[PDB]
Amino acid sequence: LLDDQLKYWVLLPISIVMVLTGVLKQYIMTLITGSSANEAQPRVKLTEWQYLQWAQLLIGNGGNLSSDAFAAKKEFLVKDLTGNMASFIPQTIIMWWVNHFFAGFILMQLPFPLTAKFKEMLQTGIICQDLDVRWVSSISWYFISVLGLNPVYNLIGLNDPPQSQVDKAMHAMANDLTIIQHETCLDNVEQRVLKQYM
Amino acid sequence: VFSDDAFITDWQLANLGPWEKVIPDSRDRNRVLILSNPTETSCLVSSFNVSSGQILFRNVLPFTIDEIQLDSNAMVCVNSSSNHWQKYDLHDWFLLEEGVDNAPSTTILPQSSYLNDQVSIKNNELHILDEQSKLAEWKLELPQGFNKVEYFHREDPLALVLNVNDTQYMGFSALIPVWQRDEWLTNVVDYAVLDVFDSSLWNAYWLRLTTNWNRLILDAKDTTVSDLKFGFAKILIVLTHDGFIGGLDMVNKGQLIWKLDLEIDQGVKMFWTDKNHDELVVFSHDGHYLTIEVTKDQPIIKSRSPLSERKTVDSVIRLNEHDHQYLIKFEDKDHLLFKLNPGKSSHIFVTEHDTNGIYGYIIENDTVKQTWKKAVNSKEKMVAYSKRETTNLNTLGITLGDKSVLYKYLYPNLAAYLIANEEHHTITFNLIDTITGEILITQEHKDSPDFRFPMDIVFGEYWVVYSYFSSEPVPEQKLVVVELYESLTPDERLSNSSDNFSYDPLTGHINKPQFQTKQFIFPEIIKTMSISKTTDDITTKAIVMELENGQITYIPKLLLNARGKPAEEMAKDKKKEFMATPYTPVIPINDNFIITHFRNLLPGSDSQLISIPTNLESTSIICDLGLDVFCTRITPSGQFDLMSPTFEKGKLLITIFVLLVITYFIRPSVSNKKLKSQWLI
Ligand SMILES: *[C@@H]1O[C@H](CO)[C@@H](O)[C@H](O)[C@H]1NC(C)=O
Ligand SMILES: *[C@@H]1O[C@H](CO)[C@@H](O)[C@H](O)[C@H]1NC(C)=O
Numbered sequence A: 001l002l003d004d005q006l007k008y009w010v011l012l013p014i015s016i017v018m019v020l021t022g023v024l025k026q027y028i029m030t031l032i033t034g035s036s037a038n039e040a041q042p043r044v045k046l047t048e049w050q051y052l053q054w055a056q057l058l059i060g061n062g063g064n065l066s067s068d069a070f071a072a073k074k075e076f077l078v079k080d081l082t083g084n085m086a087s088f089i090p091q092t093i094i095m096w097w098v099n100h101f102f103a104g105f106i107l108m109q110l111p112f113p114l115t116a117k118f119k120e121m122l123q124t125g126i127i128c129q130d131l132d133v134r135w136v137s138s139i140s141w142y143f144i145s146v147l148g149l150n151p152v153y154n155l156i157g158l159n160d161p162p163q164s165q166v167d168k169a170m171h172a173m174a175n176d177l178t179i180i181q182h183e184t185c186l187d188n189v190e191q192r193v194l195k196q197y198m
Numbered sequence B: 001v002f003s004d005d006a007f008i009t010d011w012q013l014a015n016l017g018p019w020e021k022v023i024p025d026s027r028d029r030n031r032v033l034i035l036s037n038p039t040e041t042s043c044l045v046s047s048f049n050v051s052s053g054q055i056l057f058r059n060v061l062p063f064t065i066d067e068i069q070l071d072s073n074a075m076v077c078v079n080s081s082s083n084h085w086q087k088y089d090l091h092d093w094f095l096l097e098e099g100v101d102n103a104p105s106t107t108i109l110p111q112s113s114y115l116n117d118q119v120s121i122k123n124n125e126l127h128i129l130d131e132q133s134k135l136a137e138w139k140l141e142l143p144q145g146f147n148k149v150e151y152f153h154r155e156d157p158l159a160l161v162l163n164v165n166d167t168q169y170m171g172f173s174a175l176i177p178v179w180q181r182d183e184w185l186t187n188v189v190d191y192a193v194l195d196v197f198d199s200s201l202w203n204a205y206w207l208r209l210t211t212n213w214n215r216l217i218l219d220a221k222d223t224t225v226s227d228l229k230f231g232f233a234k235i236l237i238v239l240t241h242d243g244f245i246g247g248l249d250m251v252n253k254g255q256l257i258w259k260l261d262l263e264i265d266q267g268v269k270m271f272w273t274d275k276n277h278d279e280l281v282v283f284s285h286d287g288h289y290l291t292i293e294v295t296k297d298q299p300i301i302k303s304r305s306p307l308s309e310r311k312t313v314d315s316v317i318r319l320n321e322h323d324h325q326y327l328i329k330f331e332d333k334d335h336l337l338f339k340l341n342p343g344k345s346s347h348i349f350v351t352e353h354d355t356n357g358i359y360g361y362i363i364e365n366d367t368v369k370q371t372w373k374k375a376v377n378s379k380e381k382m383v384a385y386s387k388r389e390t391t392n393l394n395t396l397g398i399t400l401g402d403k404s405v406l407y408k409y410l411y412p413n414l415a416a417y418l419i420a421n422e423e424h425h426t427i428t429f430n431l432i433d434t435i436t437g438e439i440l441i442t443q444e445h446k447d448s449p450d451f452r453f454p455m456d457i458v459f460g461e462y463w464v465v466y467s468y469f470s471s472e473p474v475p476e477q478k479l480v481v482v483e484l485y486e487s488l489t490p491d492e493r494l495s496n497s498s499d500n501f502s503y504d505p506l507t508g509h510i511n512k513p514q515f516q517t518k519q520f521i522f523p524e525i526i527k528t529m530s531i532s533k534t535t536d537d538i539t540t541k542a543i544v545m546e547l548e549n550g551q552i553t554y555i556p557k558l559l560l561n562a563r564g565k566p567a568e569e570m571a572k573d574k575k576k577e578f579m580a581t582p583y584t585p586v587i588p589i590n591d592n593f594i595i596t597h598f599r600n601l602l603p604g605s606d607s608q609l610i611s612i613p614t615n616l617e618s619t620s621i622i623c624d625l626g627l628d629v630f631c632t633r634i635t636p637s638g639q640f641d642l643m644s645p646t647f648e649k650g651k652l653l654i655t656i657f658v659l660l661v662i663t664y665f666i667r668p669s670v671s672n673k674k675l676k677s678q679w680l681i
């Protein structure tokens, strides 16, 4: 075959619109998500929330290096305590767009041999029945675009309950963290350091 | 699709041939009736405004010219074998009246008598004389040629017509050449194609740099280069039924590129002497042959000579390009091997048809021998024939929905033909091995055929279509398609392993096909069929039809599907095909398909359709050569190769610009807003 100089008006617009549409998508998604605060509510509830977070981090952070100081905390603890839209919106709409404006062409030649049923779906524009395995219509180039475009976005540069009973649940975890795990540090540090830095 | 390029792309010429009778009109006095190109069953009658080339209408009527006479005006015509007579109105060709009881009257048409009344040519220059007071008004030079004055009208809408040269014809009025006509092109027998075309390492680096940097130091959509790149610009060399060759441009509405006159007195065939497409050999009816040099300049007759025996020739069959042989069939049924020139076991088989039979012939040792014969019996008569056109191969098998394959039947040595027998009323179809003579298939139809309407046969890639008229289903035109498959079983390659088997056709150990056939109901009577092509047999092969009225129509191959189903049993019947269009026997006519949208295109009694390949595979040329010449650019599937003539590129560009402006709106905004508001610096 001999396709004639439509490489300007389709292939470039297809890559170009994918580039702009995704860059816009990241800008739009970033715009849509705004917290701008936690809330504007009274003082107390965030205050005891961060107390709860202090307990939570004590589970991870402070529950390792406190062989002497483990028990001293626990008295205190008990007393003190007690996008899919981003997928759907752009790309489905532009499937309609491309089939609307770009149809009924053989746009290019993929380099690789597909199987016949790939050649079933891709050429809905053309109405030949034994054309070839390799040639493809316009919409196939889109089908290759969406899954291959992550390097482009990198290279241009872009990047990514009950109020009281749950307190009792973490008080039960305060009870659990007493002797569920007493971690072996401030005992093996001499062994570990002599094992290393030689 | 059509409205944009309706008359721009379609390219019609109308020919009348050398005049025989011309009669002035009862009304619209700047108008006559033009009678031309007699033939033993009919002749060409037309109506024409004299002051232009504007033909008003044309008709082929089934009478020898002599019957056509004025009344006692009303242009009476009388059959002589019977007593059948037709009275036709001059102005609008209405058949005023008919009879068989008696002719109304006749008046044999008067002779010119132009001399002694209006004509004098004395100083090698013409002078129109008044009958009295012979003042020699309206004098005019004789051109280089002059044969006759066809017609002259002295009344207020003055007109004069000259047969200046054998083929050039000039209209005049009060002298001034007013219009020009050429009727050398009235009947072409055989055709040929000529195309036109444009016009260590370290040093390579720099010379490439210099030449391309000189290159390096907006769209403008120009049409002329597009034409030549895709092969549209071409020279058609047409051979007339008379002796004339000439080059006609495939672009620019067929301006005559060049015209050469022979002395062969009727033409039969055309051949390029070699693949170079530089030198033709052209055959006389009388038994001469000419060798002609085709150049961008006007041609030159580089040779004339006899054949070995000065005998009348019926036809010529092209033998090998490389071996430079040709076969000549003379009437009296005499065959001559033809070793023409240098052009400055290994058997060959050649096969020819008559109404008496199909014969087959073999060449060996610089001689021709009959290889077999097959004549129909007395009452019978062979009617329609076609061979297998060679084909470049794309797909060895037709597939099914569940990636299953039926292996369409590819045997190259095939021809197909018809037999019609009276009183049996049996159109018999045979699909014969053209080498051996085995039949492989019989299909009769006792459906009350007519034998009076045209029937024709075309041989496809793996399929055959022939068409006939008959009554017993209904009195309607009938297309019959047969499709040839290696095995009717859903997945079987019957005896086609090819690694090294190297099958022999001459012996007859070849596979034999199974077939499936259907037919269809068609509105209009079909004269003749052929097949569209491109260089590669890729698109749907787009059967082209030529009708009785002169109209052309293409219908795709796919609507004619044998193994189609009546569409109750197709519904998610997974095994059938990919998007099997149903069988649907009733094919209504769709005017969108038709070429020659409002053109008349009188093709004459004997005309041919040919398919000329081009590049740009969506497009193909199909040409109707014969009494009238006509061609087109035709798309089987609608244009998929061409980008478009009719994009809304401005809408696309503007939408892209909408993207860019919305970028310009949001990027400073959103970057500042969100980074600084979420950081609350
Ligand atoms: C008859 O032909 C002449 C020549 O072109 C043209 O000028 C004239 O209009 C025609 N007659 C009619 C009724 O159009
Ligand atoms: C007159 O009619 C007969 C009847 O068929 C036909 O054979 C003959 O050809 C007709 N005359 C001419 C001149 O064609």
Ligand SMILES: *[C@@H]1O[C@H](CO)[C@@H](O)[C@H](O)[C@H]1NC(C)=O
Pocket: B143, B144, B145, B164, B165, B166, B168, B169
């Ligand atoms: C008749 O012959 C002349 C001389 O060769 C040439 O111009 C042309 O073929 C014809 N001329 C005219 C005026 O028809």
